[PDB]
Curated annotation (Swiss-Prot), chain B:
It is found in: Nucleus. The gene is TFB3. It comes from Saccharomyces cerevisiae (strain ATCC 204508 / S288c). This is RNA polymerase II transcription factor B subunit 3. Present with 3050 molecules/cell in log phase SD medium. The chain holds residues 8 to 145 of 321 of the full protein. A zinc finger (RING-type) spans 6-53.
Swiss-Prot record, chain C:
It is found in: Cytoplasm; Nucleus. This is DNA-directed RNA polymerases I, II, and III subunit RPABC2. Belongs to the archaeal Rpo6/eukaryotic RPB6 RNA polymerase subunit family. Signal peptide: none annotated. It comes from the Eukaryota.
Curated annotation (Swiss-Prot), chain D:
This is DNA-directed RNA polymerase II subunit RPB4. Component of the RNA polymerase II (Pol II) complex consisting of 12 subunits. RPB4 and RPB7 form a dissociable subcomplex associated with the 10-subunit Pol II core complex. In exponentially proliferating cells, only approximately 20 % of the Pol II complexes contain the RPB4-RPB7 subcomplex. In starving cells, that enter stationary phase, RPB4-RPB7 is associated with Pol II in a stoechiometric manner. The RPB4-RPB7 subcomplex probably associates with TFG1. Interacts with LSM2 and PAT1. The gene is RPB4. Pfam families: RNA_pol_Rpb4. Keywords: Acetylation, Cytoplasm, DNA-directed RNA polymerase, mRNA processing, Nucleus, Phosphoprotein, Transcription.
From Swiss-Prot, chain F:
DNA-dependent RNA polymerase catalyzes the transcription of DNA into RNA using the four ribonucleoside triphosphates as substrates. Largest and catalytic component of RNA polymerase II which synthesizes mRNA precursors and many functional non-coding RNAs. Forms the polymerase active center together with the second largest subunit. Pol II is the central component of the basal RNA polymerase II transcription machinery. During a transcription cycle, Pol II, general transcription factors and the Mediator complex assemble as the preinitiation complex (PIC) at the promoter. It is found in: Nucleus. The chain holds residues 169 to 224 of 1733 of the full protein. Component of the RNA polymerase II (Pol II) complex consisting of 12 subunits. Interacts with DEF1; the interaction is direct and serves to bridge RPB1 to the Elongin complex in a DNA-damaged dependent manner. Interacts with the Elongin subunit ELA1. Interacts with the Elongin subunit ELC1. Interacts with ASK10. Interacts with ESS1. Interacts with RTT103. Interacts with SHE2. It comes from the Eukaryota. The C-terminal domain (CTD) serves as a platform for assembly of factors that regulate transcription initiation, elongation, termination and mRNA processing. This is DNA-directed RNA polymerase II subunit RPB1. Coiled coil: none annotated. Belongs to the RNA polymerase beta' chain family. The gene is RPO21.
Length: 54, 138, 83, 157, 171, 47
């Protein structure tokens, strides 16, 4: 919400009311600088050790 | 007394007296908690109770309801010597004369200890304590 | 909390994003000296080798599809129908 | 400190890797040597299995044969074996079972009985001074008896 | 104290170690890093019990670099010092501030001020030894030290001991 | 005690009592009153 327009007011109300953020939003993951759940990053890639012996 | 209970903490009545005042059996001197804890916590040294030089050891304290140092020492030595002698030459057969004579000897020993005499008979009483302990071990 | 194999109700087809990340991660491993499971026809580029392994389903990976309620599923890329 | 109040991971309540509750395992310097020296043997069997396809000399020689097993990065464990062996008077796990039978008979804390079995004392005042947690939790005559039976269980090897 | 605790560690593997035998490699790494090292939370790790039934759980791929991350739960024998703990040791290095007692893998230090008054430092001897009124503290001599405090820094643990109190000193 | 009317003026808060006695509320007084706030009070406000 703070990213769009009124940054300082939203931040001040957030800190005042002890607000918590889930941090799965788009802009949130952008600001923190790591992978977001969009497209390629909307799923994790794993490894199966039982498949290496195939 | 309410005016002497620790050379550093002699008047703690208006400071909420919530600390106890321990007494070491080798000094017979009152020391408050925060002082004695540092005393035996920094090492077994003597307390400065009016220039006291007898070393205060770690732990081995006691609570005192105050019955004067004379009677407290006489009851501590009385109980200790009573345990050293145990029931030797006492309730062995039922005699009353020799029993009262032996009790007279024990009370005379405790008397010589509480009076000290000349630091000569009391040492013989200590050797008597070692002999009685050797008899109780066997 | 890991939905079992008899209750996996997601699409069995591999999406373009799953194929993309599988070819990207697999090609990245091949570039980092990974054991190749397919005989090469003379290729040098790692992406072509990754697509060669995807064409024969020799890629040893399994996808953990996250569900919106917090759960997930394990769809191996060998059982996923490509294209 | 030493007031029966350890850290978080060293609390009386422990949890194994299966999820069950387990009491804190406290070991004295007697079976603690037979457990390291014990597991190193099966570790040597595990190292020689995949390979197919007087009291001080044996200690250092076995520590060398086990040093060849490891990658030469854990010699402080062998020096710890020399420390324990130089400070150990017990032997054989049967006698150790008897020692646990004598320590658990009083109903004390595992750390307390560990400090009891790990220290060599002759009187009860020694055990009460070296162990600040034990001063009134158990009788002195019983501690002297435990030290007597232990004194009969120790043998110069 | 020599305790036994179940520890968990995250092992990182290079993509070149993804052979069918990789499990062995895991155990290999699980030894090379854990045995001999030290942690500020569990103390000096001595040995690792149960080598056959080592749980592998499931390996996860982190984003960049492509390295593999594993969460291993095992049982290990570790050594953790404690404050106010009577231990025994042998001197190694000597200093004017005090002799450095060696207790297992830990090198405890005893301050000169934490020593009785009769124990004096002697530098004229080779090696310099602490001579008292009855006991002579030398390198090869065995001394029972009561640890007063311990420091739990990451991968480094040092403790401070004393022998001023009764029933202590040379063995 | 009659609760005054708090008005904002020049980065300050002036309190008006009708009883009229108007007194300016200082920062130390407001902070004291805030120090006497119970848990249910400010947690009922959104803190
Ligand atoms: Zn005082
Ligand atoms: Zn005194």
């Amino acid at each position: 919400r703070c990213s769009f327009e009124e940054t300082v007011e939203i931040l001040f109300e957030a800190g005042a009311s002890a607000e918590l953020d889930d941090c799965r939003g788009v802009s949130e993951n952008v600001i923190l600088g790591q992978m977001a759940p969009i497209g390629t990053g909307a799923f994790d890639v794993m490894i199966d050790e039982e498949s290496l012996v195939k | 007394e309410n005016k002497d209970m620790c050379p550093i903490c002699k008047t703690d009545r208006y400071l909420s007296p919530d600390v106890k005042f321990l007494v070491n059996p080798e000094c017979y001197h009152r020391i408050c908690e925060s002082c004695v804890d540092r005393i035996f916590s920094l090492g077994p040294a003597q307390c400065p109770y009016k220039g006291c030089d007898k070393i205060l050891r770690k732990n081995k304290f006691k609570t005192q309801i105050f019955d004067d140092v004379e009677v407290e020492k006489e009851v501590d030595i009385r109980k200790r010597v009573f345990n050293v002698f145990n029931k030797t030459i006492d309730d062995f057969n039922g005699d009353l004369v020799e029993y009262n004579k032996y009790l007279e000897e024990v009370e005379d020993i405790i008397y010589k200890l509480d009076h000290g005499i000349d630091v000569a008979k009391t040492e013989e009483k200590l050797r008597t304590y070692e002999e009685l302990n050797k008899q109780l071990i066997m | 909390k890991a939905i079992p194999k008899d209750q996996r109700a997601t699409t069995p087809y591999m999406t373009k994003y799953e194929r993309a990340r599988i070819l990207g991660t697999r090609a990245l491993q091949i570039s980092m000296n990974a054991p190749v499971f397919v005989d090469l026809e003379g290729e040098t580029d790692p992406l072509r080798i990754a697509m060669k392994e995807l064409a024969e389903k020799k890629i040893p990976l399994v996808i953990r599809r996250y569900l919106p309620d917090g759960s997930f599923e394990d769809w191996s890329v060998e059982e996923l129908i490509v294209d | 400190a030493a007031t029966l109040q350890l850290g978080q991971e060293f609390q009386l309540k422990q949890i194994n890797h299966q999820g069950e509750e387990e009491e804190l395992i406290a070991l004295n310097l007697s079976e603690a040597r037979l457990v390291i020296k014990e597991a190193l043997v099966e570790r040597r069997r595990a190292f020689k299995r995949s390979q197919k396809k007087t009291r001080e000399k044996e200690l250092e020689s076995i520590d060398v044969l086990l040093e060849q097993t490891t990658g030469g990065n854990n010699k402080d464990l062998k020096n710890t074996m020399q420390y324990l062996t130089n400070f150990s008077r017990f032997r054989d796990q049967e006698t150790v079972g008897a020692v646990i039978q004598l320590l658990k008979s009083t109903g004390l804390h595992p750390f307390e009985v560990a400090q009891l079995g790990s220290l060599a004392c002759d009187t009860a005042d020694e055990a009460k001074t070296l162990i600040p947690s034990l001063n009134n939790k158990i009788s002195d005559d019983e501690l002297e008896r435990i030290l007597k039976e232990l004194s009969n269980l120790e043998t110069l090897y | 104290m020599f305790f036994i605790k179940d520890l968990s560690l995250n092992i990182t593997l290079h993509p070149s170690f993804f052979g069918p035998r990789m499990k062995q490699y895991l155990k290999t790494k699980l030894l090379e890093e854990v045995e001999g090292s030290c942690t500020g939370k569990f103390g000096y790790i001595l040995c690792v019990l149960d080598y056959d039934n080592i749980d592998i759980q499931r390996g996860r791929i982190l984003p960049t670099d492509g390295s593999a991350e594993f969460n291993v739960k095992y049982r290990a024998v570790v050594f953790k010092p404690f404050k106010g703990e009577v231990v025994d040791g042998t001197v190694v290095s000597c200093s004017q501030h005090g002799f450095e007692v060696q207790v297992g893998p830990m090198k405890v230090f005893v301050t000169k001020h934490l020593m009785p008054q009769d124990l004096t430092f002697n530098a004229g001897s080779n090696p310099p030894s602490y001579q008292s009124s009855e006991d002579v503290i030398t390198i090869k001599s065995r001394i029972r030290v009561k640890i007063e405090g311990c420091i739990s820094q990451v991968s480094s643990i040092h403790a401070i001991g004393s022998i001023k109190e009764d029933y202590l000193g040379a063995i | 005690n009659t609760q005054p009317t708090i008005r904002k003026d020049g980065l300050k808060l002036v309190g008006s009592w009708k009883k009229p006695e108007l007194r300016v509320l200082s920062t130390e007084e407001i902070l004291n009153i805030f120090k006497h706030i119970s848990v249910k009070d400010f947690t009922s406000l959104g803190f």
